[PDB]
Design an enzyme around this catalytic site. Structure first.
Site, mmCIF file in Angstrom:
data_model
loop_
_atom_site.group_PDB
_atom_site.id
_atom_site.type_symbol
_atom_site.label_atom_id
_atom_site.label_comp_id
_atom_site.label_asym_id
_atom_site.label_seq_id
_atom_site.Cartn_x
_atom_site.Cartn_y
_atom_site.Cartn_z
ATOM 1 N N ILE A 102 7.747 27.134 27.077
ATOM 2 C CA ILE A 102 7.450 27.973 25.942
ATOM 3 C C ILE A 102 6.136 28.729 26.119
ATOM 4 C CG2 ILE A 102 7.157 27.974 23.440
ATOM 5 C CD1 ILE A 102 8.846 25.394 23.396
ATOM 6 N N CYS A 103 5.092 28.010 26.511
ATOM 7 C CA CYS A 103 3.784 28.615 26.702
ATOM 8 C C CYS A 103 3.830 29.790 27.686
ATOM 9 C CB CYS A 103 2.792 27.566 27.195
ATOM 10 S SG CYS A 103 2.549 26.177 26.094
ATOM 11 N N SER A 104 4.574 29.615 28.776
ATOM 12 C CA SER A 104 4.722 30.643 29.803
ATOM 13 C C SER A 104 5.373 31.877 29.192
ATOM 14 C CB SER A 104 5.593 30.099 30.947
ATOM 15 O OG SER A 104 5.699 31.023 32.013
#
Lengths: 163, 163
Positions: B57-59
């Site tokens: 998700i962060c990516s």
């Protein structure tokens, strides 16, 4: 004295030496669970400390030590760095060393502070190698002066082998 | 009510709300230098805080905002995480986002505790999105209740473009 990125760095407090007992710790492993010295009782340990496995010398150190000491019974190889658990996990996967024991001190910097390995100027861990016996007594230590260079593998392993 | 890894999590202090002034900070960038609010003076800013770019998700989040809000005149998307600079730099090269602005809070954890985004249980940064004014006023902010889920890209993106 010690140098990092072409500049002398400092630390706080005294660093453990041969004869001293290894300080306990609470570090986060690659699966987010915590680890302490106890989890390794009954074993001899090669404590390897690196600035970040996301850099060349630090990656080789970790890889090489895990490989060249894998055939050693009663001995375990602990890698401690400031990388987040997620970074160490990615590393293991890329290197095919999913079982390598990676420990992160990101939560507290407590390991770095207790061992006086936390570089005051960067808050990364200075390059070092310890070889503890079963009683967790330090029988070998190496504080690489030029952190931007490889450690002494030979001495370290020879020491781990004699023990 | 914020959760992380399925279980509820808390923070210390009060989180900033729309209308509030964004607090200053000194984070380490990918080239190891330090940046503060002053370094992006006179520009709109999209503060995207993430747990760690070495996660799915962060990516996606960091990649989305950078691409979407790319070109937006006088607007910068500042990514903040607990990831070491080396992790952020490595990620940038692998994703083809070399000009992307990555800032790490590994050193002090100061940003996290100042913005009350430092997860008490994990010492990682909760997922949040800010859209700051040229005067650094928070015109829009979102704290993802389920840190393990993606934010409202549409809502954040619309605010920046509307600013």
């Amino acid at each position: 004295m010690v140098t990092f990125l072409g500049n002398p760095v400092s630390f706080t407090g005294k660093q453990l030496q041969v004869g001293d007992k290894a300080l306990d710790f609470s570090l986060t492993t690659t699966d987010l669970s915590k680890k302490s010295l106890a989890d390794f009782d009954g074993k001899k340990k090669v404590l390897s400390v690196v600035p970040s496995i996301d850099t060349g010398i630090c990656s080789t150190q970790t890889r090489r030590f895990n490989e060249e000491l894998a055939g050693l019974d009663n001995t375990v190889v602990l890698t401690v760095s400031m990388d987040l658990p997620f970074a160490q996990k990615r590393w293991c996967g890329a290197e095919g060393l999913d079982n390598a024991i990676m420990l992160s001190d990101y939560f507290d910097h407590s390991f770095g502070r207790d061992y006086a390995l936390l570089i005051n100027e960067w808050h990364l861990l200075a390059r070092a190698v310890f070889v503890l016996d079963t009683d967790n007594t330090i029988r070998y230590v190496e504080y690489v002066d030029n952190i931007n260079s490889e450690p002494n593998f030979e001495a370290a392993i020879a020491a781990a082998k004699a023990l």
